[PDB]
Amino acid sequence: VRMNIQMLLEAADYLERREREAEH
Amino acid sequence: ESDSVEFNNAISYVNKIKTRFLDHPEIYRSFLEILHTYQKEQLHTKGRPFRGMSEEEVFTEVANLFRGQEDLLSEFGQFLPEAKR
Numbered sequence: 001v002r003m004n005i006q007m008l009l010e011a012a013d014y015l016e017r018r019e020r021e022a023e024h
Numbered sequence: 025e026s027d028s029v030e031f032n033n034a035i036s037y038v039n040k041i042k043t044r045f046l047d048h049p050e051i052y053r054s055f056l057e058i059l060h061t062y063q064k065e066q067l068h069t070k071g072r073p074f075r076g077m078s079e080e081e082v083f084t085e086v087a088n089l090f091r092g093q094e095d096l097l098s099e100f101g102q103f104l105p106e107a108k109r
Contacts, residue, residue: 003030005062005082005103011034012056015042 037099044093051089058085079104
């Protein structure tokens with residue numbers, strides 16, 4: 001159970017990187 | 025099996041934020057910038073974690089950005105460890 005605001009900076013950097021993964 | 029449900033609950037939130045702030049591409053700068061004042065703690069010390077600041081402030085700023093949408097700050101409440109009720 002690690003729901004702290006840390007998750008928002010994690011999810012953000014994740015999702016930034018996810019778009020770049022998807023292009024190929 | 026590994027718990028990453030709440031990770032995806034964060035993803036879904038950020039993705040919702042990003043999908044609703046299409047009229048506002050600027051929010052994607054300042055939103056995280058505010059939480060970066062929070063998250064700083066982990067890299068600031070040479071040892072222990074901290075709280076950052078007061079959880080009320082990081083909230084306070086994001087609210088002015090997001091303003092109009094109370095429903096987003098509703099989900100923000102999950103990432104604030106208060107009472108859990």
